[PDB]
Amino acid sequence: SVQIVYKPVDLSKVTSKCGSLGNIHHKPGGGQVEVKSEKLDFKDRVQSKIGSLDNITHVPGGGNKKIETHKLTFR
Amino acid sequence: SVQIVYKPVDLSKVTSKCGSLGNIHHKPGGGQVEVKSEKLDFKDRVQSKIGSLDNITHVPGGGNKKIETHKLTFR
């Protein structure tokens, strides 16, 4: 005679913390920005950004994958 | 005689915390921005941005996946 007791217990935790988290009393200060542009000639496509402060979180990465598998073969 | 007691317990926890979280006292300062553009010539497509402050939390990455698979067999 045979018994199989198959009782995996999984309490595991898979946590991603990403970006600007738990930060306190930040005062990021952009200075003055002055742009003079005169008589400039562009023969082709232009991409431009101007500004005193960029404050940015970009988070492509959080990305948890859990793969879990439980085979029991009695043949 | 045969007994199989297939009783996994899953209490596991997959969690993603992405971007800006729990940030307690921020005062981002946009500076003054001045742009003077004169007699500029563009032959082709222009893309532009102007501003004192950008305050951006872009998150492509929340990203959780969980694959789980139970497979008893008795043949």
Added chain:
Amino acid sequence: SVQIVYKPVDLSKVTSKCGSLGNIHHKPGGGQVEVKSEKLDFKDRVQSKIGSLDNITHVPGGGNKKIETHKLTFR
């Protein structure tokens, strides 16, 4: 006669912590920025950024993978 008891207990705590976490009392200061441009001549595709301060957290790296596999057999 045969008994198999298969009681794995998983309490694992796979954690990622990326970017600006738990920072206190920053005052990042951008200086004044002055750009003079006159009579420039661009023959091909242009990309430009001007600004006093960049305060950026870019995080592609959260990235948790857990692969877990149980495989009992009785042939």
Added chain:
Amino acid sequence: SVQIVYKPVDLSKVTSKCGSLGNIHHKPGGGQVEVKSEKLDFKDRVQSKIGSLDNITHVPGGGNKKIETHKLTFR
């Protein structure tokens, strides 16, 4: 002339979470209880209890008081 703008904002949050809350997986097991009493004598008040399991969650204490006083005086 005199102007008084008395506009206090209350958004504050008193809260009590007393007792047995959010407890996920529990299986309290009472055991076998056997009592044999013979030839006993009790000349005064008896109070008694017998049982395998008590799961009591008595909460006398969880109350709030939130006294608030406002007074504007112009004598």
Added chain:
Amino acid sequence: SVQIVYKPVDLSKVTSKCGSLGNIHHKPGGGQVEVKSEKLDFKDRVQSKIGSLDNITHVPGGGNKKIETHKLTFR
């Protein structure tokens, strides 16, 4: 002329968490209890209990008092 602006803002928490909260996978196991009582004599008040498991979460504390006062006097 006189201006008084009186705009206190309260967003504060006053939280009590008391007793038995957020617990996981508990299995308290009372054992066998056997009582033999023979020929016992009690001349005064008896208060008695028998049992394998007391899973009791008594909370007679955990209350809150918030007292708040706002006096503006213009005498």
Added chain:
Amino acid sequence: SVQIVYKPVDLSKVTSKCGSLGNIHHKPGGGQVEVKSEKLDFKDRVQSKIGSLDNITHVPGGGNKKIETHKLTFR
């Protein structure tokens, strides 16, 4: 002229966490108990308990007080 601005901001977080919080895998065991009371004799008040396991979480003390007081005066 006289201008008084009175803007106290409260973001505070008075918090109590008392008793058995966030425990993850307890299996408290009670042993077998066997009591052989024979021929005993009690002339005065008896208070008694028998049992394998107490899992008691008494919280008589976890309370909060926040006392808060604003006074503005113009004599």
